[PDB]
Amino acid sequence: PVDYQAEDATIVQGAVESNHAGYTGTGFVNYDNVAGSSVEWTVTVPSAGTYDVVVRYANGTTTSRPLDFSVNGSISASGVAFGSTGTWPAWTTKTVRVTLAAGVNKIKAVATTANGGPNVDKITL
Ligand SMILES: O=C(O)[C@H]1O[C@H](O)[C@H](O)[C@@H](O)[C@@H]1O
Numbered sequence: 703p704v705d706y707q708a709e710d711a712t713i714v715q716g717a718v719e720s721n722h723a724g725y726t727g728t729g730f731v732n733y734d735n736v737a738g739s740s741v742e743w744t745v746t747v748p749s750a751g752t753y754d755v756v757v758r759y760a761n762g763t764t765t766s767r768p769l770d771f772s773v774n775g776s777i778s779a780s781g782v783a784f785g786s787t788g789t790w791p792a793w794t795t796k797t798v799r800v801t802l803a804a805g806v807n808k809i810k811a812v813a814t815t816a817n818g819g820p821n822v823d824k825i826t827l
């Protein structure tokens with residue numbers, strides 16, 4: 703049951719920020735508000751199979767901000783909606799099923815809409 707901080711991951715069109723309370727680690731990733739913004743985590747698991755990946759995020763708007771999840775090149779979850787949390791400090795979790803190989807994997811979450819992604823604190827699996 704391991705935490706992988708977003709601010710420690712590979713960030714494309716985003717910024718490590720810390721101005722909303724409740725994040726874990728040293729901060730969170732604020733996705734740029736464009737399609738294509740992404741965070742990519744390097745994770746390690748002991749066995750091949752499908753893992754529950756718990757995404758901790760916030761969305762202080764009324765519009766869902768969908769992400770596509772992929773593992774080392776291949777789609778894992780398409781159009782996962784990240785709906786309102788009301789305020790930016792009100793972190794919530796959503797579980798996404800991802801199939802992994804034994805050992806090291808990269809899990810990428812890319813924003814598919816012009817609003818970019820929710821703010822993302824971490825994933826846990
Ligand atoms: O709408 C957005 O994406 C942004 O809105 C605000 O600026 C908020 O403080 C950011 O944390 C958020 O990322």
Ligand SMILES: [Ca+2]
Pocket residue numbers: 732733734735818819
């Ligand atoms: Ca943003």
Ligand SMILES: [Ca+2]
Pocket residue numbers: 707708709725726727728729730731822823824
């Ligand atoms: Ca964090």
